Amino acid sequence: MKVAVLGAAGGIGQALALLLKLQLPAGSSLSLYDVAPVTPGVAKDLSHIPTDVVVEGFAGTDPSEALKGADIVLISAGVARKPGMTRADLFGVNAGIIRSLTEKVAEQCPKACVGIITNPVNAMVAIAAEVLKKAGVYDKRKLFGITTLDILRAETFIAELKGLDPTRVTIPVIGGHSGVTILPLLSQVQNVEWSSEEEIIALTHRIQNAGTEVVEAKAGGGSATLSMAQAAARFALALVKASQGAKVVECAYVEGDGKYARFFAQPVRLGTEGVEEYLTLGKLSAFEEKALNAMLETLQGDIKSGEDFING
Amino acid sequence: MKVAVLGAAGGIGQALALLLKLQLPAGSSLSLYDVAPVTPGVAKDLSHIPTDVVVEGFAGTDPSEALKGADIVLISAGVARKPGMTRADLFGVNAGIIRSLTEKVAEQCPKACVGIITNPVNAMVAIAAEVLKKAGVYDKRKLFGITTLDILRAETFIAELKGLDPTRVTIPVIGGHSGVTILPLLSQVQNVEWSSEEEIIALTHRIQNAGTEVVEAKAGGGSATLSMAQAAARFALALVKASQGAKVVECAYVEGDGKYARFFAQPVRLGTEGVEEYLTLGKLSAFEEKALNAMLETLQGDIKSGEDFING
Ligand SMILES: NC(=O)c1ccc[n+]([C@@H]2O[C@H](COP(=O)([O-])OP(=O)(O)OC[C@H]3O[C@@H](n4cnc5c(N)ncnc54)[C@H](O)[C@@H]3O)[C@@H](O)[C@H]2O)c1
Ligand SMILES: NC(=O)c1ccc[n+]([C@@H]2O[C@H](COP(=O)([O-])OP(=O)(O)OC[C@H]3O[C@@H](n4cnc5c(N)ncnc54)[C@H](O)[C@@H]3O)[C@@H](O)[C@H]2O)c1
């Protein structure tokens, strides 16, 4: 098992690299790549931790050496939202970074699973799909938008509100990865009596807007880095577990059956070659059915913006 | 169990806070304090992780709120060595930070265990001891210089050189926490046939100088942050395990029997009230006995420099 992290010198990159150095299976390797000159030193820092995980670090213009033989590629490269900045600002900075790095994946490790962290995920994942298609290597089973932070948030907020164990709250989160496209299926949550519709609506809002609590409370210091690194590590370790032949189930933004949108976040069962089965959303409340049809235009617009960058 | 991290917004601080948010026992709390205005946002970032660990964050001039009810206080506050900077540069920047923060420990949580990360540890721990003594609350069983990074390095370098499992290499490291004061007892290492004296000397050197490999390879980007956060978390979790009534054994820089120096890094058994027993160094090789007597002057000089800052 070899995992490559592209953007490994950043806030998310460094914490993610630490969690993977601590938690990847003994016998694994970890390669870090970032345009930041510090990157070989980040790898040197991690190499002092006593786990049987070979860690190498690369800066420079060419991630080919980090990517050679990679099974899993995690991309946290690009700028984070600071106060004042819009989705549109992020797209303009990050689209070309995602285009550049996914071209190099197609060249060096086209059979790898690819996990996109870089925002806006909804559009960045469609960019990577179109680059892989232009290279003739696109396997839709192997490309993921990492939405796992929306799951961490949902688990935490449910457990804190309802006095539950946050380690054992399960909650599917479907749709997309931004504002109104995030749909947590609170109707399916166990061991909770909802006060009323009010409580469900307010919890849904808090899950959808949680990034702003952080962006705000850091006050220009940046966005969520440490929670996102945990979310990415959790997803990555799920893919490693699936590579060993485990049944693994995770919410991720994937090119599925296209019932609602070309890309849609849903529970998937992972096998040894990416997605093995696309799982049901299960039973939606009236509230969930309406929220689903209400955000579909935004989600399809996010996808189009990524497709149109690569293809017109 | 409540753990306070002073310096929680820095390179070490943030990664340490993440590992404690992930690993402290369910029912724990974690309070973060730093002079950096971002600190409440670091805590907000971590609060989105689904563990039963209450995380709060404080900036401003007064750590009293973070420290109220603390059982364990970890101090990573102060500047790290960049290229050009000497031990003397660090002492001048960090002495007053350690004096200030330990006065606040004496006021708000005098019965807490205190773990000093801030360098130079050899002198910073004697400063904290003299501040606690001036406040009339010093318990020498409860004050530690965290040397655990020297243990991580020793474990890793032995396992990489000798083809061993780095998760199961045990190596006592004694003396102090800088250059020639670091003494790894390589004579006691199992499952290894030393090529010759040469190999033991070169491995000892690499353990003593490992910080420079990182400071160098980051090239001004800073020193070891991610490995040090793991080392601090390991030590902290050892103290939490001891609080539950476990026999726990760790190398730490402590005011022991003073056979070699007032403060000396040695294996200690932890109980529920800090150090319960000061353990033997065991059998020293000729090489280890000579290296021990050869660095003692430097170590005693490091301690004096801390004592003399507080007392003349
Ligand atoms: N999916 C999610 O839930 C989620 C949540 C939080 C943030 N994010 C996103 O993650 C990204 C990283 O955020 P951060 O806070 O770590 O940012 P950061 O600025 O700290 O780190 C980004 C890193 O990307 C590197 N980078 C830039 N161009 C590169 C290239 N061509 N190749 C390799 N590395 C390159 C930079 O040098 C930097 O080290 C941002 O886009 C942010 O929006 C996603
Ligand atoms: N013991 C070891 O093995 C070991 C190894 C590596 C580094 N270190 C030391 O750890 C320290 C931290 O290193 P780093 O790389 O995280 O540095 P950093 O500069 O990234 O972080 C230091 C933090 O301390 C904060 N701080 C400063 N004064 C403060 C005060 N009065 N109260 C609270 N917070 C305060 C700063 O605002 C900053 O957030 C340095 O002294 C470094 O030498 C120790």
Author numbering:
A (entry chain A), B (entry chain A): 1 to 312
Please share text taken word for word from the publication where this structure appeared.
Considering that M. succiniciproducens is the most efficient SA producer, it was our surprise to find that MsMDH exhibited the lowest activity among the four MDHs compared. Detailed kinetic analyses of MsMDH elucidated its low activity at pH 5.0–8.0 and its high susceptibility to substrate inhibition suggesting that MsMDH might not be an optimal MDH for enhanced SA production. In particular, MsMDH activity was significantly reduced by substrate inhibition under acidic and neutral pH, showing much lower ki values than CgMDH throughout the entire pH range. On the other hand, CgMDH activity was reduced only to a small degree due to relatively mild substrate inhibition as reflected by its high ki values over the entire pH range. It is notable that substrate inhibition of MsMDH tends to be alleviated with increasing pH, showing a pattern similar to its pH-dependent activity. Noticeable differences in the substrate (OAA or malate) and cofactor (NADH or NAD+) binding sites of MsMDH and CgMDH were found from the conformation of mobile loop36 and the lengths of β7-β8, α2-β2, and α7-α8 connecting loops. Comparative analysis of the OAA and malate binding site (the α7-α8 connecting loop) revealed that Ala224 in MsMDH corresponded to Ser242 in CgMDH. Also, Leu101 in MsMDH, a residue involved in the binding of adenine moiety of NADH, corresponded to Gln117 in CgMDH. Presence of a protruding Gln20 in CgMDH was also observed at the pyrophosphate moiety binding site, whereas MsMDH was found to possess Gly11 instead. All the other variants showed reduced activities compared with their corresponding wild-type MDHs. These results suggested that the replacement of Gly11 in MsMDH with Gln (e.g., Gln20 of CgMDH) endowed MsMDH with high overall catalytic performance observed with CgMDH. The MsMDHG11Q variant developed based on structural analyses exhibited significantly increased kcat and higher ki values compared with its wild type.
